[PDB]
Design an enzyme around this catalytic site. Structure first.
Site, PDB file in Angstrom:
ATOM      1  CG  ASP A 184      11.065   1.789  -2.100  1.00 59.26           C
ATOM      2  OD1 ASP A 184      10.210   2.145  -1.249  1.00 59.26           O
ATOM      3  OD2 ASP A 184      12.267   2.152  -2.067  1.00 59.26           O
ATOM      4  CB  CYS A 198       0.772   7.935  -5.180  1.00 58.47           C
ATOM      5  SG  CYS A 198       0.150   7.695  -6.881  1.00 58.47           S
ATOM      6  CB  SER A 199       4.728   9.661  -7.396  1.00 60.19           C
ATOM      7  OG  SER A 199       4.322   8.519  -8.135  1.00 60.19           O
ATOM      8  CB  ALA A 200       2.219  10.196 -11.702  1.00 64.18           C
ATOM      9  N   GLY A 201      -0.081  10.195  -9.192  1.00 60.10           N
ATOM     10  CA  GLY A 201      -1.474  10.225  -8.815  1.00 60.10           C
ATOM     11  C   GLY A 201      -2.310   9.445  -9.795  1.00 60.10           C
ATOM     12  CB  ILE A 202      -2.126   7.775 -12.627  1.00 61.48           C
ATOM     13  CG1 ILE A 202      -0.637   7.470 -12.833  1.00 61.48           C
ATOM     14  CG2 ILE A 202      -2.452   9.225 -12.980  1.00 61.48           C
ATOM     15  CD1 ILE A 202      -0.166   7.630 -14.312  1.00 61.48           C
ATOM     16  N   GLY A 203      -1.267   5.598 -10.345  1.00 64.49           N
ATOM     17  CA  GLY A 203      -1.013   4.185 -10.095  1.00 64.49           C
ATOM     18  C   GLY A 203      -1.550   3.653  -8.782  1.00 64.49           C
ATOM     19  NE  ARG A 204       3.207   3.375  -4.483  1.00 67.16           N
ATOM     20  CZ  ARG A 204       4.277   3.648  -3.749  1.00 67.16           C
ATOM     21  NH1 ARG A 204       4.175   4.451  -2.699  1.00 67.16           N
ATOM     22  NH2 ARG A 204       5.452   3.113  -4.070  1.00 67.16           N
ATOM     23  CD  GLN A 257       0.290   3.787 -14.576  1.00 69.88           C
ATOM     24  OE1 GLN A 257       1.412   3.860 -15.061  1.00 69.88           O
ATOM     25  NE2 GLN A 257      -0.801   4.168 -15.234  1.00 69.88           N
TER      26      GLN A 257
END
EC number: 3.1.3.48
Length: 499
Positions: free
Chosen positions: A396, A430-436, A477
């Site tokens: 997380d 992923c969530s915003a599709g930028i970090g992971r 990120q």
């Protein structure tokens, strides 16, 4: 243009800067050393300094009491054109007017500090090209700096004598910098920028062009262990260096901002660049970009919303993608990250004109593979297998302590992709599709070079990240993600040199 970011200041020192050098509306950002990963927006208003927290656990910049952003430069730009948006608890508006400029030259690509004159020449000689320059600290004359530039015909070594390496003294006199005469600049940055517009000319007519900084981040993969060690006790400077370049990337995102599209975005201000957005002709909008290394390409997209599931399946179909990498639990830390957009095992489901069958779920240690059959309605012949790799053991907060799991996962995704001759881009989200997402795609791109060309090839992590960031905002990120990329590539290297 990121001068407002102070990579080394403390919460207290910034208070001073904004109170002495600053007026009402002056602001700067700094990495808070409260939580590594956290940032602070320190803004001077009504005589005093208010600190505004910005959290980044790895998915996005979360401005406390504000909105979420792909990068700090996008965060700042946003507010310096939506006055009355940044509000405090009791509705008061917080104006961001005057970027309080930092003078620390550390994050500039051209600054190297710790470097001897023999080194500099060696580097400019081997790596350098016409226009390659660097600024190092002077050892012969402490406190002062040296600009080394290359001019000539071709790059790399040579004896034709066509190229050369001129050095210029930069003195620090009472907190300003000069080249021996003329103007005195308040910072190295200012001095350098001036001598790119107005290049020094030598007596006999040699023009000292400051074209491009010299590259010190490109390593030979074979030697990545030694470089990581060297960076372990660098990573931060190299990373904040990479981060300073994000200001070059404030590309347009108009399509995402349109009215009809606002509710197709998971986070209103994390949007696809116009020039690389996936366009659906099957409206035409989805929050996704094609990422193309510059053979295998990628679509990096946010986690589906309920009202975008149909669009997601339209995109997969249209793009001919046959693999999907999902790097997030549907729910994390309380909040939704991605809605379930696949059928339960054995079930068949219709998402608009698209039809998906979950034919078989396999459970491995770090992920779950779901074999999906996707087809269009009315035309049962467009049946194609789509393999969804759902990675499950990503913490997380922060990143995996060991890249082994991610590496094995990626190897598998790679072989899948490779076994399908048609396959279009690998969708990654992923969530915003930028970090992971960015982390997974960069590692994948890097490993792929090593797999192709071998252990005796050149790789450049920040250069690869920067190339990816120019195709979708904020790809990769955090510094933790930055280091994890180095460790994943390292780990990959020695398991190649062991098998």
């Amino acid at each position: 243009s990121r001068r407002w970011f102070h990579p080394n200041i403390t919460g207290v020192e910034a208070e001073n800067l904004l109170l002495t050098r600053g007026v009402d509306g002056s602001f700067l950002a700094r990495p808070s050393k409260s939580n590594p990963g956290d940032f602070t927006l320190s803004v001077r208003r009504n005589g005093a300094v208010t600190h505004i927290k910005i959290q980044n656990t790895g998915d996005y910049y979360d401005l406390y009491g504000g909105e979420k952003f792909a990068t700090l430069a996008e965060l700042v730009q946003y507010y310096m054109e939506h006055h009355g948006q940044l509000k405090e608890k009791n509705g008061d508006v917080i104006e961001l007017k005057y970027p309080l400029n930092c003078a620390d030259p550390t994050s500039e690509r051209w600054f190297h500090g710790h470097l001897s004159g023999k080194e500099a020449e060696k580097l400019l000689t081997e790596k350098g090209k016409h226009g390659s320059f660097l600024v190092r600290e002077s050892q012969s004359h402490p406190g002062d700096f040296v600009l080394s530039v290359r001019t000539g015909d071709d790059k790399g070594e040579s004896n034709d004598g066509k190229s050369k390496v001129t050095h210029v003294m930069i003195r620090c006199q009472e907190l300003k910098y000069d080249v021996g005469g003329g103007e005195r600049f308040d910072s190295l940055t200012d001095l350098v920028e001036h001598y790119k517009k107005n290049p020094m000319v030598e007596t006999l007519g040699t023009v000292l062009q400051l074209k491009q900084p010299l590259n010190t981040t490109r390593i030979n993969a074979a030697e990545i262990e030694s470089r990581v060690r060297e960076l372990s006790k660098g990573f931060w400077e190299e990373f904040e260096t990479l981060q300073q370049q994000e200001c070059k990337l404030l590309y347009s995102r108009k399509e995402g901002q349109r009215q009809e599209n606002k509710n197709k975005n998971r986070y209103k201000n994390i949007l696809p660049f116009d020039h690389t957005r996936v366009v659906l002709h099957d409206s035409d909008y989805i929050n996704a970009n094609i990422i193309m290394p510059e053979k295998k390409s990628y679509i990096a997209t946010q986690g589906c919303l309920q009202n975008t599931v149909n669009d997601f399946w339209r995109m997969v179909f249209q793009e001919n993608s046959r693999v999907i990498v999902m790097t997030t639990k549907e729910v994390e830390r309380g909040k939704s990250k991605c809605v379930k957009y696949w059928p339960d095992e054995y079930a068949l489901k219709e998402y608009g004109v698209m039809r998906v069958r979950n034919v078989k779920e396999s459970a491995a240690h770090d992920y779950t593979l779901r074999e999906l059959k996707l087809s269009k309605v009315g035309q049962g012949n467009t049946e194609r297998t789509v393999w969804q790799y759902h990675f499950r053991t990503w913490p997380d907060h922060g990143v995996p302590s060991d890249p082994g799991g991610v590496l094995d996962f990626l190897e598998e995704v790679h072989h899948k992709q490779e076994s399908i001759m048609d396959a279009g881009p690998v969708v990654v989200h992923c969530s915003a599709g930028i970090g992971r997402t960015g982390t997974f795609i960069v590692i994948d791109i890097l490993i792929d070079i090593i797999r192709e060309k071998g252990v005796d090839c050149d790789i450049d992590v920040p250069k690869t990240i920067q190339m990816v960031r120019s195709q979708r905002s904020g790809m990769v990120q955090t510094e933790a993600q930055y280091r994890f990329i180095y460790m994943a590539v390292q780990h990959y290297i020695e398991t190649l040199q062991r098998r």
